[PDB]
Each structure stands twice: as C-alpha cells, then as structure tokens.
Homo-oligomer: A and B are copies of this chain.
Amino acid sequence: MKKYRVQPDGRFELKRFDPDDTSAFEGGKQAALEALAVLNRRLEKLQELLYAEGQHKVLVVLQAMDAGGKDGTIRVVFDGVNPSGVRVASFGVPTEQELARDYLWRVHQQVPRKGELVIFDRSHYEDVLVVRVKNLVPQQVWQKRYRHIREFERMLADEGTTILKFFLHISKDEQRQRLQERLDNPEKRWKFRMGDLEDRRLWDRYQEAYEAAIRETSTEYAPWYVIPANKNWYRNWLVSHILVETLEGLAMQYPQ
C-alpha cells in the first residue's frame, strides 16, 4: 500500500524490509486468494478500459534475485487479462548489436505505447546491478547511470507513461530452497544451469546494488515498491493491490 513505497529522499535502507513480512493483509493464504480473485477481476476490467481509452501507457518493472518470483508474478497476477493489451518484454544478457549502443537503447524499444501495458521482465536496472556486482564496467561509468535512469523514466512519465517498479524481496535462505527445489523438479530442472550459483555466492553484493539503485532511482513519477516475496500468495496479492489502485487513480473512461 503505502508501507512499501520508498520515498524520494535518499534515506531508503533495505534492512528495514523483511521478506517474510505479511503485515499488510490480516489473514493467511486462504483469505488472500479470495482477495486475489476479486482484485484479478478488477485488473481485467481496468486493462480493457486502458485498451479502449487508448491514451495512457502503463509500464510494470519487475526486478528480483534469481528465483525471486518474477515469472510467478507475471503468470498469476495477469491471469485472464486480454493478450492483445498486455505484453512481456524480457531483457536477458545483451547481444553484440545491443551492446554497440547505449544500455537504454534496447530498453527504450520496448516502452509501452498508448493503451498498452508492458511488463519488463528484468529491465534497464540490470545495467546498475549485474554490471556493478561483476565489474563488467568501471565504477565511474555506472555511477552516472543512476541519473540517466531517473531522467529517462521522467521523460517517459512526462509523455504519458505510468511507471511502477516492484522489487520482489526474498531472503538468502529462501533462495537456497527454491533453487534446490527447481533442481529436483523435472519440469523446472531446465531453467537452472550451474552458472546461476556463483550469483548466489555474490548475494551480499547484489543486495548492496539493489539498495543503492532503489535509493537513487525511486522518484515521485517512477516510484519503487519493495515486495516481500517469500510468500507467493502475499507477493501476488500485494503486487495486485498496488497495481489495481494506481490504474483506478487515472480515472480512465470508455470513449463515446
């Protein structure tokens, strides 16, 4: 709601958030899945209002550690929404043609148009996290990218884009459970490859990067939301709540 919105004052500290926290919903899994169902219908009717009006642009950014629940959020929260009005843009490791330009070049290509909702499955923030943790570029160049993102997102917002960025917060031990479970599942053993366990060895470094990126790039036009994602039912409900409330705030109407 407003507990998880980080304000643009440069005071954000990541240790003030617990991945197992569930204090916003006065209930358990069975009670939230009832609130998730009613929220999902409101999201479906809001998205058809967004597509019909065709004036607003909605950009949902999902960033999290590996197995943090990015795909789970996309699959569950946007169940039933019209496929012609929502699209997922995934930003993996860059190609040679994409590294030949600025890091914002490939991301700007996928910005939502009018009447469209685009979910960034990993976004331009990958260029201030994995590139910072593994030292793929000097510290001098990515220390300046904090200002580029603030101004790039400001340009989007001033031109009619509503920006929501969610950080799915999971604990270090919970990742050890999900990665071990992903290996012991035939139908999920394929997503994991042994190149994703050294990233876990740099757990503390990715958390300092996420703390700094959120402390710097969270603005009023593009706010950051920290989502405790140790409980899938609570993560799916809280992301659904914040997203639906912001869409109704736009006061959109069907064209006459």
Contacts and interface: CB of A to CB of B under 8 A. Distances in A.
Residue with the greatest number of chain B CB neighbours at <10 A, chosen from A87, A145, A158: A158
A187 B52 contact: yes
Interface SS majority for chain A: mixed
Given A113-B101, A159-B103, A84 B95 contact: no
A156 B105 CA distance: 10
A134 interface: no
Interface stretch (A27-35, A71-79, A241-249): A71-79
Contacts of A195: none
Contacts of A152: 151-152, 155
Nearest to A70: B84
Nearest to A75: B82
Interface in A161-202: 161, 186-187, 189-191
Given A96-B95, A190-B52, A151 B144 contact: no
A111 B105 contact: yes
Identical subunits present: 4
A164 B132 CA distance: 30
Contact of A102 (B155, B254, B255): B155
A139 interface: no
Contacts of A5: none
A251 B255 CA distance: 46
A81 B83 contact: yes
A159 B102 contact: yes
Interface in A116-141: 116, 119, 121, 141
Contacts of A104: 108, 155
A41 to B, nearest CB: 12
Interface of A: 48, 52, 57, 71, 74-75, 78-84, 86-88, 90, 95-97, 100-105, 108-109, 111-116, 119, 121, 141, 144-145, 147-148, 151-152, 154-156, 158-161, 186-187, 189-191, 254-256
24 contacts: A48-B187, A74-B84, A75-B82, A75-B83, A78-B83, A80-B80, A81-B83, A83-B83, A83-B119, A84-B88, A95-B96, A97-B113, A101-B113, A102-B111, A102-B155, A102-B161, A104-B108, A105-B108, A109-B109, A147-B151, A147-B154, A148-B151, A151-B154, A190-B256
Given A102-B156, A144-B158, 7 more contacts: A84-B88, A100-B115, A101-B111, A108-B108, A148-B151, A148-B158, A152-B155
